[PDB]
Symmetry: C2
Subunit: 313 residues, 2 copies
């Protein structure tokens, strides 16, 4: 069955079998005035498989999302937004689990686009590891350039070789993704039980191969020592973002760092690392949580008193 809803104020409620007739979502709480169209959503959808009709050799135009309510004349009305995908599962039956993820990613798209305009929040994820290959550096312009979402232009070949290797031998490997949210206003999160890190973990943990979630330095913290605050020299600065942007479960101000670990996954099926495909959904999940908490934080302000630096519309 299903626990098919997520969010208090930004709410996504869904349904649909991968083999069923179609897939649906109702998304509540998105304020009126947001330019929004189907294309905005597909573009994130189609990001899940980074091919055009290019990617799978003879693949069709993919199944397309349709906005059924909530948008008037290109803009959000501020009523509940309905999404539909009709499954053109072309007329033992298998199942492709990109259909099971669609509604999340279409909804996250809505929360991304809203948070980018309003705040310039930018939510982006990259695979740091596949099995025994690690990326060692980050270049945002590189992650779209290779089919692993890898920020390290020199590991891409090494990742590529490991994928080529596994394919040969009827195996598959684990993955670790990092997702970041930047330009996130301070103060979001709801201790005790709805800390921003908690909802994040909750949300990420809805993705299927996930075995862990961490925030900031995450697990390394186990081995660390409390050597961060009392004495400085003249130059130094302790913005290492050890907390990964959440402290006491409310946003810092700093970028938000979350990592997750996806496990290995069971004609030639080119399996081998389905985990990299989780990036756009991991990005989706984070957006959905931040939007929810945006709305909660606003609902708890009689009205605003900044603070806001030289302004950066």
């Amino acid at each position: 069955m299903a626990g098919n809803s997520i969010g208090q104020l930004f709410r996504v409620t869904t349904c649909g079998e991968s083999h069923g007739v179609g897939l649906m979502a109702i998304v509540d709480g998105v304020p009126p005035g947001l330019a929004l169209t189907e294309e905005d959503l597909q573009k994130d959808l189609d990001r899940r498989k980074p091919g055009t009709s290019k990617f799978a050799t003879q693949r069709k135009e993919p199944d397309q999302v349709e906005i059924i309510s909530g948008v008037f004349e290109g803009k959000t009305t501020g009523t509940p937004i309905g999404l539909l995908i009709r499954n053109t599962d072309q007329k033992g039956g298998g199942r492709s689990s990109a259909r099971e993820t669609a509604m999340r990613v279409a909804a996250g798209a809505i929360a991304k686009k809203y948070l980018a305009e309003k705040f310039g929040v930018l939510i982006r994820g990259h695979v740091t590891q596949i099995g025994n290959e690690v990326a060692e550096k980050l270049d945002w312009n590189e992650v779209p350039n290779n089919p692993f979402f890898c920020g390290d232009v020199d590991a891409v070949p090494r990742f590529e070789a490991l994928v080529t290797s596994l394919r040969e031998q009827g195996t598959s490997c684990g993955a670790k993704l990092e997702i970041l949210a930047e330009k996130v206003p301070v103060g979001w999160g709801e201790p005790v039980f709805d800390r921003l890190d908690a909802d994040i973990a909750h949300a990420m943990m809805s993705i299927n191969a996930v075995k862990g979630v961490e925030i900031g330095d995450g697990f390394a913290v186990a081995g660390q020592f409390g050597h961060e605050t009392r004495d400085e020299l003249t130059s130094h600065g302790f913005l290492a973002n050890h907390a990964g942007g959440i402290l006491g479960g409310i946003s810092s101000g700093q970028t938000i760092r979350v990592a997750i670990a996806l496990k290995p996954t069971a004609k030639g099926r080119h399996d081998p690392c389905v985990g990299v495909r989780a990036t756009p959904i991991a990005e989706a999940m984070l957006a959905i949580v931040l939007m929810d908490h945006f709305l909660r934080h606003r609902a708890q302000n009689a009205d605003v008193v900044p603070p806001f630096a030289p302004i950066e519309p």
Copy 2:
């Protein structure tokens, strides 16, 4: 300034400031007929101090939980159960935060008893690592013999040396705890968004200082390769809980394995590794989610029927 509640069927709602008059919870959803008095709760509350006789230079009584409603003649009636702790702030000297943690432990104590009596579920935690010291073996008998919740009697010496140093040096260190849930029935959890692992993670992260949560093999999984090897005479059995007792977001029937990483914090009240005192609260939170998913699982179906299982009173 709170999101002060957790659960859908087993629901726990709280309030109380540490220097407020008192602390309260209202716990919803416990079936009638569980044997319950204040003592079943203090035992758990008083476990935040592995030694209560074992204290630095003086100890108060301490502070006693009172059950306000939902029990008759020693038994849950099935009505919401009210809990209160009146702060004897005493009307400085010694100040502790054990207070923001009490209603959680008290309510976990309840979930825990019900699970223990009904399904014989066993939820215990142990500290696997403090700073640079790691414990190797687990002997449940050891766990309450030391003040570290440590299951390895050869690590106790080392943990003691480490902590004794750090306190005189004035340094704090992080910890890593493992919490286990044994004899948990198969079936529990609610995908897509309320998977058991998602709600575990969510809950673990309400504990301050947690920077990571992992299920089963957890972060090891990024570096792993996949198959159920193999077809030959010796090959590894599926029940090595790689999954830590959750599959596709629902309990497997295997033991539930959860690890969390807690970061270092910052007269003789110096907390070098407060992380170890989090063990009872991680037990409570795991009990609270389990209890919740039990009821939700009951609610889902009209008729329970085999497997025969172990449902042991």
